[PDB]
């Protein structure tokens, strides 16, 4: 379910953003799954609090990092 819901999300994040030819050309190899889905879409997430401010994703930028701590402590 980290392969089901990673593929539901990236197929739909390419339709909602209009870039349907992003999923259709770079999901056939594992770099585009890592470059165009994980690395690209986490840009607006980890900037939930930069040194210059704080927006409405400041709790999702914190829970995203609370969940790396809970995974690593496992």
């Amino acid at each position: 379910l980290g392969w089901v819901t990673f593929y539901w999300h990236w197929k739909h994040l390419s339709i909602w953003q209009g870039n349907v030819a992003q999923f259709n050309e770079s999901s056939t190899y594992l770099m585009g799954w890592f470059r165009d889905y994980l690395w690209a879409n986490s840009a607006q997430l980890i900037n939930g609090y930069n040194p210059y401010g704080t927006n409405n994703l400041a709790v999702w930028a914190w829970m995203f990092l609370f969940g790396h701590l809970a995974w690593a402590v496992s």
Partner: protein, 45 residues
């Protein structure tokens, strides 16, 4: 005192309290004994 001060800064930066965290702008923790050895090794040349 090293990792949970990175979780104090991580919570103050998310709260919008950049004056409450262990910064050079907030609560300063200066390396007093290691800034002094940088002063010794340039005054003995």
């Amino acid at each position: 005192h090293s990792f949970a001060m990175y979780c104090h800064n991580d919570t103050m930066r998310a709260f919008g309290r950049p004056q409450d965290m262990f910064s050079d702008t907030g609560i300063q923790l200066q390396p007093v004994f290691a800034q002094w050895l940088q002063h010794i090794h340039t005054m003995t040349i």
